[PDB]
Design an enzyme around this catalytic site. Structure first.
Site, PDB file in Angstrom:
ATOM      1  CB  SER A 145     -48.736 -23.485  69.686  1.00 15.12           C
ATOM      2  OG  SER A 145     -48.405 -22.981  70.917  1.00 15.12           O
ATOM      3  CG  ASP A 244     -49.228 -28.162  75.131  1.00 14.22           C
ATOM      4  OD1 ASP A 244     -49.518 -28.496  73.963  1.00 14.22           O
ATOM      5  OD2 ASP A 244     -48.855 -27.134  75.505  1.00 14.22           O
ATOM      6  CG  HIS A 293     -46.103 -27.224  72.420  1.00 11.89           C
ATOM      7  ND1 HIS A 293     -47.478 -26.995  72.898  1.00 11.89           N
ATOM      8  CD2 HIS A 293     -45.628 -25.900  71.783  1.00 11.89           C
ATOM      9  CE1 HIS A 293     -47.630 -25.799  72.298  1.00 11.89           C
ATOM     10  NE2 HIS A 293     -46.736 -25.020  71.859  1.00 11.89           N
TER      11      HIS A 293
END
Ligand code: 657
Ligand code: NAG
Length: 349
Positions: A145, A244, A293
């Site tokens: 991330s 995502d 994610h």
């Protein structure tokens, strides 16, 4: 378990001025070093950072960090959980700078918070050299991330730092997970401006070649993988879900369960197509057609496959490719099917 070490250079701090740090589990029989950058969004002004300090304080301060952390996924030392690098030296670098790992500004009379992400990475690397990193063959800078974007922003600087310190034999590489975003139009108006504001607020820094292309005022462009990646010299493996959840969130897409109508169907299909397009010239990549994610520190990261190849296998094939295409050992794995979960190996829940 990885054990916490706070930075001996206490001028390198989390947002609130407390020392930054790293968690380390050494593997004396290995010359591989994995340095993982934690994610967790960011903050871009005083008011937004103040709110983050109330309810996400571990992402802004080391004061409450635990003495140990369990290594999971690619940070696991068990071959069953981590077929790729189970024997490596493992480092988890907590994200406590709220700056997508880009900042180089100290807390001061004029700054309520310090944004030192780029300096944290360099200080961790410098302090690790005395704990065995000096003998490394490969330093893999990985992250998920905001940490995955941080890899793209920092991998070449780590390489340059080790070259300048006199360690040209350490091969620096990047693994960017879930940090490859599109600066696309939102599905409904409510990401480019947030980064533009953040860069000024953090004194954020971007890789030099990318900075020279986009020039002053436009450095925010270098936070977008498809723009910064072509400028990088170090090998970087890109892991990115085609759908995502953080991308969909910034795009103002919320999938409840009612039938998706044509406008949103086309929006989602176009997003996957654009993501696929941006990866077509990324030779080391793993991009499954799933709504999810992050992946690399999840304990079940071994389960997803693209074209029958798992991510740990693809990373192993990448390692082989960097010795000096391989039969049955692919490194570029991007799904072509156009809807979340058209890949049967996508995560469930
Ligand atoms: N260009 C951009 N880089 C990033 C990195 C992290 C981030 O937080 C999120 F949670 F969305 F990953 C957003 C963005 S936008
Ligand atoms: C500590 O970190 C600061 C900021 O990166 C740097 O300017 C300074 O040289 C460092 N000091 C030592 C002793 O490493």
């Amino acid at each position: 378990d990885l054990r916490l070490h706070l930075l001996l250079n206490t001028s390198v701090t989390c947002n609130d001025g407390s020392p930054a740090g790293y968690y380390l589990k050494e593997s004396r029989g290995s010359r591989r070093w994995l340095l993982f950058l934690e994610g967790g969004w960011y903050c871009f002004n005083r008011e937004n950072c103040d709110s983050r300090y109330d309810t996400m304080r571990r992402l802004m301060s080391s004061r409450d960090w635990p003495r140990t952390r369990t290594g999971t996924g690619i940070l696991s030392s068990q071959p069953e959980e981590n077929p790729y690098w189970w024997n490596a030296n493992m480092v988890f670098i907590p994200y406590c700078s709220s700056d997508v790992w880009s900042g180089a500004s100290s807390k001061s009379e004029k700054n309520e918070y310090a944004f030192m992400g780029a300096l944290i990475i360099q200080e961790v690397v410098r302090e690790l050299l005395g704990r065995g990193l000096s003998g490394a063959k490969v330093l893999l800078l990985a992250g998920s991330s905001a940490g995955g974007t941080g890899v793209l922003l920092n991998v070449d600087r780590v390489a340059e730092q080790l070259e300048k310190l006199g360690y040209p034999a350490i091969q620096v590489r990047g693994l960017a997970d879930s940090g490859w975003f599109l600066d696309n139009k939102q599905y409904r108006h409510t990401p480019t401006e947030a980064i533009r504001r953040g860069i000024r607020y953090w004194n954020g820094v971007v890789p030099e070649r990318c900075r020279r292309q986009f020039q002053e005022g436009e450095e925010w462009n270098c936070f977008f993988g498809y723009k910064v990646y072509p400028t990088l010299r170090s090998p970087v493996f890109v892991v990115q879900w085609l759908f995502d959840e953080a991308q969909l969130t910034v795009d103002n897409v919320h999938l409840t369960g009612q039938p998706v109508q044509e406008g949103l169907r086309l929006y989602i299909q176009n997003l996957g197509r654009e993501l696929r397009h941006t990866l077509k010239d990324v030779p080391a990549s793993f991009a499954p057609a799933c709504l999810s994610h992050e992946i690399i520190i999840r304990s079940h990261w071994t389960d997803v496959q693209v074209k029958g190849t798992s991510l740990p296998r693809a990373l192993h094939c990448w390692d082989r490719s960097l010795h000096d295409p391989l039969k049955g050992c692919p490194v570029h794995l991007v799904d072509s099917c156009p809807w979340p979960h058209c890949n049967p190996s996508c995560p469930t829940g």
